[PDB]
Amino acid sequence: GEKLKEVFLMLDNNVVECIKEITESSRNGKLVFFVGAGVSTLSDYPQWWRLVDKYHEELYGSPKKGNYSSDEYLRIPQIFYNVKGEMAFDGILKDFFQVDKPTNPIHDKILAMNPAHVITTNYDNLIDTACWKRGKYFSVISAEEDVANATSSRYLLKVAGDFRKGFKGENVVLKEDDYLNYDQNYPLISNLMKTIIATHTIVFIGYGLGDYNINMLLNWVRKLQKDSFHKPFFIRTDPSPIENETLIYYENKGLRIIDAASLIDSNEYDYLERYSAVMDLLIESQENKFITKDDEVIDYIYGKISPLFALQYIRKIDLKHVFEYDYHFEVNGTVVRHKNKGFGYMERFFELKESCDERSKLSKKQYERFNALFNFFEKNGVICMAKDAGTLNTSIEINSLAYHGKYDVMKKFIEEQSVSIEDDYKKAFFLACLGRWEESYDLYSNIILNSIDESNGCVYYLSQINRYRIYQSITQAVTQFNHYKPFTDEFLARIEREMTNFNIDDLFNGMPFEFQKKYKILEFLSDNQFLYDDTVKLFELTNKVRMSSDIVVLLRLYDNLRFLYENCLWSVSFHEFHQYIRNSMSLLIEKAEYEGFFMEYYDFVNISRHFKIDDIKNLERS
Amino acid sequence: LESKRYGEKLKEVFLMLDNNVVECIKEITESSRNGKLVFFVGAGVSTLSDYPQWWRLVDKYHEELYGSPKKGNYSSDEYLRIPQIFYNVKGEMAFDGILKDFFQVDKPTNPIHDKILAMNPAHVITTNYDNLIDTACWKRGKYFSVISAEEDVANATSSRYLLKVAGDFRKGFKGENVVLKEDDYLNYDQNYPLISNLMKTIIATHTIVFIGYGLGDYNINMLLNWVRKLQKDSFHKPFFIRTDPSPIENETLIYYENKGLRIIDAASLIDSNEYDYLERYSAVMDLLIESQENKFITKDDEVIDYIYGKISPLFALQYIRKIDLKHVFEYDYHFEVNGTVVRHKNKGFGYMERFFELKESCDERSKLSKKQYERFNALFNFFEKNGVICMAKDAGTLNTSIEINSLAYHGKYDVMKKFIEEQSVSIEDDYKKAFFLACLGRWEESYDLYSNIILNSIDESNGCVYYLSQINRYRIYQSITQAVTQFNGYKPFTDEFLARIEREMTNFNIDDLFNGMPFEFQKKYKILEFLSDNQFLYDDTVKLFELTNKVGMSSDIVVLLRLYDNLRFLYENCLWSVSFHEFHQYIRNSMSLLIEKAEYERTRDIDGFFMEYYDFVNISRHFKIDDIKNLERS
C-alpha cells in the first residue's frame, strides 16, 4: 500500500487524470470493462496460439517452425475447419475448454468499481463466476436471442461468444470467417457493443495494443464525429514500456493508455503484478487512500456536501449515508470513524477548523469551500470529533413557522410576492399546513413546471414528493370525510386526471445523476416508510428498561422533525410520523417513569400536536 | 355517460376481434407487464394534440420561396425539398426564425399521451420534436432522459430514454438540432450515427409499438429495409398502430406483415368517420389498456389461467403470506388474515369470485377444459394450503388454527440430524438441509451447502430456490461474521474458512440481487423483493403501533395470525432470516404488546388470551430471560 502510494505520488498528470475519470466513472455507475485474452491468461486459462499449434499438429503434422502472424492465427483454425470439419473442431474446443481454470484476483478487482456491463472477447466462465460469487448478476449475451432475452440492466456481452450452450464452433468467433462476416452473422451484438461503448466508460484490460478487435473499434471511432464519444481507456500491460510515438499515435486514434510497465517496476513475465498495479491503483484511488494535502480534503467533503447545501437541514443519519458509512455521526454532533480505510479527511477538516493558521495556508477557493462546509457543519450541529468531544449542549432550534404554530405569519408569508422557487416551496408547504390544499397542489404544480429546467433539482424532487403527498392527503381526506364539503368536484377530477398511477418507486430512479449520486440519501423520501430504523431504537427503549439512549432518541426525534419541518416536507403530517411521535414520546415517558425528563418547549409542542386526547388521557392514568 | 357506453363498446369490439389482432394485444400487454415496451410515436400523435404539421411549414416555405401556395399537392420528396431549397436560398436565419415562431406555439397534450404512459414504456423513440410527450412524462411521473443529439447519448442519465430520432428544440429553435431538411434525411448515418445505433439497439431489444405513423412513411421504410438486413427470427416484429381513415387493403397488410410489421389497424377495428382520428387512436390505446386491466375476462378458462399466471410461480414456495398474495395480485384483492378475500382495486372481471364460484359449484368446474381443470386443482391445493378459504361474502364458519410443519420451529433436533445425514434426492432437500445445518450450529457446512445449491441451481428455471439460497448464504454469512465479531475480536470457526468467506463474500450488493434475475425472478416472484431488503417487517410493526395507538374482525387476532403468517413463511420456506435482530425484536414487541393489551382488557372489569402450543414456543424461543421477568412483574 505504501508502494502504490509512492507510485501514485510519482505519477504524471495524464495517468492520474485517467484514474480520476475511471474513479468517477465508477462512482456514477457508468463503467464497462472490456476484457480480453490477457485477463484469462493470468487465471491460467488456455491461450489461442496453443490451439492454433494443436491445429497445426493435426493439419501439418509438425509444430510451427518459428512464429505465425495475426492472419495465420486466424487461418490455421479455418484451414482445420475446412479440411477436418466441424466435429474435430468442436472436439478440440471441448477437451481444451472443459478444463476448468480458476479466476484471478483482478477479476474481483474488475468488480470493485461496480461495472455496468462487461464486454469480454473471452469465452470463459471466469468473469462469469467472478460475478456469480461476487454478487453481481450479469445477463450473459453471446448470441442474438440472448440480446432479445437480455434480462437485467447489466449485461455480459461476449462479443466472440461463449461455451454455455455448447462447445461448438458456431457459438464463438474463433476461425477466419467468424472474423470476416462478423457484421452479417453477429449484427445485434455489434450494435449492442457500439451502443455500450458510446454510452459508458470503456476500460480495455486484457488487450495488447495491436489486437485486431481494438483496431476495429478504432476504425469505428474514426468514423464517429469529434467529441461525440468518450475515449476508451486502455490498460496496457505489455512488459516493455510503450514508446511515446506509439502512445501519441494511439492517444490520437482515441485511446487513453494507462501503461503498466511505465507505472510499476516489473519483470518480463510479471503480468499479474502489472495488472494488479493498475487495478489496485484505481481501487486505492477510489477508497480515498491517496488524499494528502488539505486541498483534496476540502474538495472531497465539498463533493459530498455542496449538494446538500440546497436542503435546510440534514440529519446525522443522512450525513452518515452521504459519506458512505465512513463516519458514523453521533447525534450529539460528534464524529466516529466507522469504515474509513483511507485518509482521515473529517479529522483533517476539524484540524483546519481548530487551527486557524492551518486554514490560513490554504488556497483561496478551497478556503471558500472551507467556509461553506464550516457554515454547513455548524448549522447542522456537527461540532467536533469523538476525541475532541468536550463541553457540548444538545439544544434544538426548529426555526419553522409551521412547527411553532404561528399561523398569521404564515398567512402573511403566503400573501407576499415570491422572489424565488424555494419561497414558492415554503409557501406551498404553509398552504398545506393552513388547510388550503388546492392552492398548495397548484403551487407544487407550478414549482415542478418552473424547476424542470434547473440543475440540482432537489426542490423539484421535494415538490414532486410533496405534490404526491398532498395528493394523498386530499384523497384520503375526501375518503374519510366524504357535514361540510372540503373540495370541489372539478378539482378532484383534475387531480384524478393528473395524479393517476404515479409510480413513487421510479421517481428517485428518474433523475439526471445529480439527483442520483449527489442526493442519494433522499431516496427514502421515495419510500412510503422511512422511520423503521428509528423505530428499532425505540425497540431498544422496549428491549425494556420499562451516551445515554434517552438523549439519543430525543435528539433523533429532533433530527427527524427538524428535517421534516425545516425542509418544508408535508410528509411530517402523516400516519407514520404521527404514530412515530406517539410511540417515541410514549415510550420515553414510560421509561423515565421507570427510572427526571424535564420537558422543554418543543416536547410540549410535540405532545400537543401529534397526540390525540386519549393519548394524554392514557399516559395520564398510567 | 361516455364511460359506460364506451367500456361496453370496447368490450363488444374486443369480442368481435379476429385471432391476429387479439394476439397482438396480448403481446403488447405482456410486453408492457415485462417492462420491455417502447413506443415509437410520430407526427400523427402530435396532430391529435393540435401541434403544427409539416406540409404547413413546407407551404410557408413555398410562400417565401415561390410566392404563391402550391397549385395542388406535393409528394414525399418535395416535402423533403422545399425546406432544403429554402435553406439553400434564404439561409439558416430565416429557417430558424420560421421554426421559432412556428414552434414556440405551445399546444397541449392529447389523452393518448397518458395512454402511452399507461403501459410503463421503457423508452419513447419519437420522430417528433415537441415537448408534449416530454411534458406528458413529466406530469405523468416517468422521467425519460431526453436524447436528440449525440452528447445526449453520452449523458443519457436514466435507464429510460426519450430518443428523439429527428431532434428537439430545447437546446435551441435551430435547424441543426432537428432532422427536417433534405440532407438531414440524406447524411443521417454520418451526422447522427450514435442515435441511429441506439435506435436500432432499442428496436432489437424491446417491443416497438409505432403509433403516430402512416404506413408509407420514409422512416418506417428505413426500418423495414434495416430489418430486411437482419436474419430471420432474430428480432421481435414491431407493432404498428395504423390509424388511417380507410380500412387497410389486405394485400397491403400481407405485404407489410411480411416485411416485419404487425399491423393493428384502427379503421378495421372501430367504426369511425374520416377525420375521426382521436377515436381511432383511443380505440387502439384503450383496447390495450382495457385488456391489461382484466376488463375482458369472460370464460372460466381465462380466469383459471390468469390466477395460475400469478400463482404457479409461488408453487415453488412452501408457504405464502396473505400480504405476499396481496402484492402478487397487484392489490386487486386485499386478503384478510383469517383467509377471506376483499375486493380492493379490481376494476375488471371479478376473477377470484369466479374462482370461488368454481370452488363451490362442482358442476361448474365440471364443464371446464381438462388442462384448466388441472390448473384449478393446482390453484385449489394452493389456496387451501395457504389458508385462503372463501370470499368476505362467503365468510361463514371459520377457525384460525396455524400449522407450522417445520422441524426447526417445533424444536426437534435429532430428527434434523437424521435428515441432515441422509442422501438428498433434490436441490430443495439440500436447501432444507442447509437451513437445518444453520439451525444446529453447523454454519460452515450450511455455508458450503448453500454454495453447492447456488452452483447446482444456476442452470435452472424458476430460480427462487437459487435466490433464497443466495439470501440465506449471505445471511448465514452475516451470522458467521457478527457471530465471530461478538464472540471473538471457545473457538467457533477456523481462520481459513473465515478467510474463505471474506474472500468470497466481499461487498455483496444485496440491493442488486433482486434486480439480477432473468425476468422469471423479476415479474413472477416480485414479492420476494423484500428479502433483498434488510428490513421487511416495518408495515407489521405499524399495526403493532395500532396495539399502542393504545388500548367485526378484532385487531388482536389480526396480529396473532399475521405473526403466524410471518413465522410460518420464515420457517416453512427454511429462511435463516428468522434468526435475526429484526425478527427477534418483532416477536418480543408483538408478544409483549399482546400480553399488555390483553392485560388491559382484563383490567377494565370495573362494573383472556389463551396461549396454545405455538405461542409458548415463540416466547420460549425468541425472548430472553429478562423479557419473561419484566412481563412477569408487569
Side-chain angles (χ1 to χ4, degrees), chain A residues 347-365:
Chain A
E347 290 84 2
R348 179 62 70 194
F349 176 72
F350 290 114
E351 283 178 352
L352 294 171
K353 184 179 182 294
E354 297 293 326
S355 180
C356 184
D357 54 352
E358 287 181 353
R359 82 182 74 183
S360 298
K361 54 178 184 290
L362 188 63
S363 177
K364 298 298 289 183
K365 180 177 88 273

mmCIF file of all heavy atoms in Angstrom, chain A residues 347-365:
data_model
loop_
_atom_site.group_PDB
_atom_site.id
_atom_site.type_symbol
_atom_site.label_atom_id
_atom_site.label_comp_id
_atom_site.label_asym_id
_atom_site.label_seq_id
_atom_site.Cartn_x
_atom_site.Cartn_y
_atom_site.Cartn_z
ATOM 1 N N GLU A 347 -11.122 14.286 10.107
ATOM 2 C CA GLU A 347 -10.187 14.697 11.145
ATOM 3 C C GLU A 347 -9.328 15.856 10.676
ATOM 4 O O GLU A 347 -9.051 16.781 11.444
ATOM 5 C CB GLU A 347 -9.308 13.523 11.560
ATOM 6 C CG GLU A 347 -10.024 12.440 12.322
ATOM 7 C CD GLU A 347 -10.730 11.458 11.421
ATOM 8 O OE1 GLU A 347 -10.632 11.588 10.185
ATOM 9 O OE2 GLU A 347 -11.385 10.552 11.948
ATOM 10 N N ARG A 348 -8.915 15.835 9.407
ATOM 11 C CA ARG A 348 -8.202 16.976 8.851
ATOM 12 C C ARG A 348 -9.118 18.188 8.744
ATOM 13 O O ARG A 348 -8.668 19.331 8.906
ATOM 14 C CB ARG A 348 -7.609 16.611 7.491
ATOM 15 C CG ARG A 348 -6.862 17.745 6.810
ATOM 16 C CD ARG A 348 -5.681 18.175 7.650
ATOM 17 N NE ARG A 348 -4.646 17.155 7.657
ATOM 18 C CZ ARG A 348 -3.627 17.137 8.504
ATOM 19 N NH1 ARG A 348 -3.512 18.087 9.422
ATOM 20 N NH2 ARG A 348 -2.729 16.166 8.440
ATOM 21 N N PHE A 349 -10.414 17.953 8.520
ATOM 22 C CA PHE A 349 -11.369 19.054 8.471
ATOM 23 C C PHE A 349 -11.509 19.724 9.829
ATOM 24 O O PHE A 349 -11.558 20.956 9.922
ATOM 25 C CB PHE A 349 -12.727 18.563 7.981
ATOM 26 C CG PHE A 349 -13.778 19.624 7.988
ATOM 27 C CD1 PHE A 349 -13.744 20.646 7.062
ATOM 28 C CD2 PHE A 349 -14.797 19.604 8.923
ATOM 29 C CE1 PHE A 349 -14.706 21.627 7.065
ATOM 30 C CE2 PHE A 349 -15.756 20.587 8.934
ATOM 31 C CZ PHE A 349 -15.711 21.599 8.002
ATOM 32 N N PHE A 350 -11.556 18.932 10.900
ATOM 33 C CA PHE A 350 -11.642 19.544 12.214
ATOM 34 C C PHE A 350 -10.308 20.114 12.657
ATOM 35 O O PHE A 350 -10.286 21.053 13.453
ATOM 36 C CB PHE A 350 -12.158 18.554 13.245
ATOM 37 C CG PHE A 350 -13.591 18.205 13.065
ATOM 38 C CD1 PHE A 350 -13.963 16.927 12.714
ATOM 39 C CD2 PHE A 350 -14.574 19.143 13.305
ATOM 40 C CE1 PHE A 350 -15.287 16.597 12.562
ATOM 41 C CE2 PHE A 350 -15.905 18.823 13.146
ATOM 42 C CZ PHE A 350 -16.261 17.545 12.782
ATOM 43 N N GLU A 351 -9.195 19.581 12.153
ATOM 44 C CA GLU A 351 -7.898 20.181 12.450
ATOM 45 C C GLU A 351 -7.749 21.538 11.783
ATOM 46 O O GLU A 351 -7.160 22.456 12.363
ATOM 47 C CB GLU A 351 -6.765 19.256 12.018
ATOM 48 C CG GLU A 351 -6.511 18.090 12.945
ATOM 49 C CD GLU A 351 -5.419 17.187 12.423
ATOM 50 O OE1 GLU A 351 -4.988 17.395 11.272
ATOM 51 O OE2 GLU A 351 -4.985 16.279 13.159
ATOM 52 N N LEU A 352 -8.265 21.684 10.567
ATOM 53 C CA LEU A 352 -8.341 23.002 9.958
ATOM 54 C C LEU A 352 -9.368 23.879 10.651
ATOM 55 O O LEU A 352 -9.222 25.104 10.658
ATOM 56 C CB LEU A 352 -8.680 22.868 8.478
ATOM 57 C CG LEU A 352 -7.592 22.204 7.639
ATOM 58 C CD1 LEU A 352 -8.093 21.923 6.242
ATOM 59 C CD2 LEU A 352 -6.358 23.077 7.589
ATOM 60 N N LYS A 353 -10.388 23.271 11.249
ATOM 61 C CA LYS A 353 -11.409 24.022 11.961
ATOM 62 C C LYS A 353 -10.851 24.591 13.257
ATOM 63 O O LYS A 353 -11.159 25.727 13.630
ATOM 64 C CB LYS A 353 -12.609 23.119 12.230
ATOM 65 C CG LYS A 353 -13.795 23.786 12.884
ATOM 66 C CD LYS A 353 -14.920 22.777 13.061
ATOM 67 C CE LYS A 353 -16.164 23.404 13.672
ATOM 68 N NZ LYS A 353 -15.933 23.864 15.067
ATOM 69 N N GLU A 354 -10.027 23.813 13.953
ATOM 70 C CA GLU A 354 -9.403 24.290 15.177
ATOM 71 C C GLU A 354 -8.320 25.311 14.875
ATOM 72 O O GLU A 354 -8.446 26.485 15.236
ATOM 73 C CB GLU A 354 -8.799 23.123 15.962
ATOM 74 C CG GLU A 354 -9.798 22.084 16.445
ATOM 75 C CD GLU A 354 -10.750 22.603 17.492
ATOM 76 O OE1 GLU A 354 -10.334 23.456 18.302
ATOM 77 O OE2 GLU A 354 -11.917 22.158 17.504
ATOM 78 N N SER A 355 -7.278 24.886 14.176
ATOM 79 C CA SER A 355 -6.094 25.706 13.967
ATOM 80 C C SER A 355 -6.319 26.678 12.816
ATOM 81 O O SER A 355 -6.436 26.281 11.655
ATOM 82 C CB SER A 355 -4.880 24.822 13.713
ATOM 83 O OG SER A 355 -3.727 25.611 13.512
ATOM 84 N N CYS A 356 -6.364 27.968 13.151
ATOM 85 C CA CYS A 356 -6.659 28.993 12.159
ATOM 86 C C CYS A 356 -5.476 29.235 11.230
ATOM 87 O O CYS A 356 -5.664 29.594 10.063
ATOM 88 C CB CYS A 356 -7.067 30.290 12.857
ATOM 89 S SG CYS A 356 -7.574 31.624 11.749
ATOM 90 N N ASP A 357 -4.250 29.051 11.721
ATOM 91 C CA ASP A 357 -3.093 29.227 10.851
ATOM 92 C C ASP A 357 -2.967 28.077 9.856
ATOM 93 O O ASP A 357 -2.349 28.224 8.796
ATOM 94 C CB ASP A 357 -1.816 29.389 11.680
ATOM 95 C CG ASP A 357 -1.598 28.255 12.663
ATOM 96 O OD1 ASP A 357 -2.498 27.408 12.817
ATOM 97 O OD2 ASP A 357 -0.514 28.208 13.281
ATOM 98 N N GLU A 358 -3.561 26.924 10.172
ATOM 99 C CA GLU A 358 -3.558 25.814 9.227
ATOM 100 C C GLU A 358 -4.530 26.049 8.080
ATOM 101 O O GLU A 358 -4.245 25.681 6.937
ATOM 102 C CB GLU A 358 -3.880 24.504 9.936
ATOM 103 C CG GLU A 358 -2.761 23.986 10.799
ATOM 104 C CD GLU A 358 -3.106 22.669 11.455
ATOM 105 O OE1 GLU A 358 -4.269 22.229 11.331
ATOM 106 O OE2 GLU A 358 -2.214 22.072 12.089
ATOM 107 N N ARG A 359 -5.687 26.650 8.363
ATOM 108 C CA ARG A 359 -6.580 27.019 7.273
ATOM 109 C C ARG A 359 -6.103 28.293 6.590
ATOM 110 O O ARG A 359 -6.571 28.617 5.494
ATOM 111 C CB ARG A 359 -8.019 27.222 7.766
ATOM 112 C CG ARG A 359 -8.258 28.594 8.372
ATOM 113 C CD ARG A 359 -9.653 28.818 8.902
ATOM 114 N NE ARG A 359 -9.885 28.111 10.153
ATOM 115 C CZ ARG A 359 -11.049 28.115 10.786
ATOM 116 N NH1 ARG A 359 -12.073 28.785 10.283
ATOM 117 N NH2 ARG A 359 -11.197 27.458 11.920
ATOM 118 N N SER A 360 -5.194 29.031 7.231
ATOM 119 C CA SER A 360 -4.656 30.243 6.636
ATOM 120 C C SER A 360 -3.692 29.928 5.506
ATOM 121 O O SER A 360 -3.594 30.701 4.547
ATOM 122 C CB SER A 360 -3.959 31.089 7.702
ATOM 123 O OG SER A 360 -4.878 31.491 8.702
ATOM 124 N N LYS A 361 -2.982 28.801 5.591
ATOM 125 C CA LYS A 361 -2.140 28.361 4.484
ATOM 126 C C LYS A 361 -2.913 27.444 3.539
ATOM 127 O O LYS A 361 -2.436 26.376 3.142
ATOM 128 C CB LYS A 361 -0.866 27.701 5.019
ATOM 129 C CG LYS A 361 -1.048 26.553 6.008
ATOM 130 C CD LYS A 361 0.310 25.990 6.387
ATOM 131 C CE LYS A 361 0.190 24.781 7.296
ATOM 132 N NZ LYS A 361 -0.299 25.140 8.648
ATOM 133 N N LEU A 362 -4.094 27.888 3.131
ATOM 134 C CA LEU A 362 -4.913 27.159 2.180
ATOM 135 C C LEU A 362 -5.194 28.074 0.994
ATOM 136 O O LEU A 362 -5.139 29.301 1.118
ATOM 137 C CB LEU A 362 -6.208 26.693 2.853
ATOM 138 C CG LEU A 362 -7.185 25.755 2.154
ATOM 139 C CD1 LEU A 362 -6.506 24.440 1.890
ATOM 140 C CD2 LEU A 362 -8.423 25.555 3.009
ATOM 141 N N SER A 363 -5.458 27.471 -0.164
ATOM 142 C CA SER A 363 -5.812 28.248 -1.343
ATOM 143 C C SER A 363 -7.162 28.923 -1.143
ATOM 144 O O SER A 363 -8.009 28.445 -0.385
ATOM 145 C CB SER A 363 -5.847 27.361 -2.582
ATOM 146 O OG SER A 363 -6.266 28.103 -3.711
ATOM 147 N N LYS A 364 -7.355 30.047 -1.842
ATOM 148 C CA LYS A 364 -8.488 30.926 -1.559
ATOM 149 C C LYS A 364 -9.809 30.285 -1.962
ATOM 150 O O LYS A 364 -10.832 30.476 -1.293
ATOM 151 C CB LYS A 364 -8.307 32.265 -2.272
ATOM 152 C CG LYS A 364 -7.083 33.045 -1.828
ATOM 153 C CD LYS A 364 -7.158 33.404 -0.355
ATOM 154 C CE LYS A 364 -8.214 34.459 -0.094
ATOM 155 N NZ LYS A 364 -8.242 34.855 1.341
ATOM 156 N N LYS A 365 -9.802 29.520 -3.056
ATOM 157 C CA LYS A 365 -11.006 28.806 -3.462
ATOM 158 C C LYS A 365 -11.379 27.735 -2.452
ATOM 159 O O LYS A 365 -12.521 27.695 -1.984
ATOM 160 C CB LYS A 365 -10.818 28.186 -4.840
ATOM 161 C CG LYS A 365 -12.040 27.429 -5.310
ATOM 162 C CD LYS A 365 -11.870 26.889 -6.716
ATOM 163 C CE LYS A 365 -11.215 25.518 -6.705
ATOM 164 N NZ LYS A 365 -9.730 25.613 -6.699
#
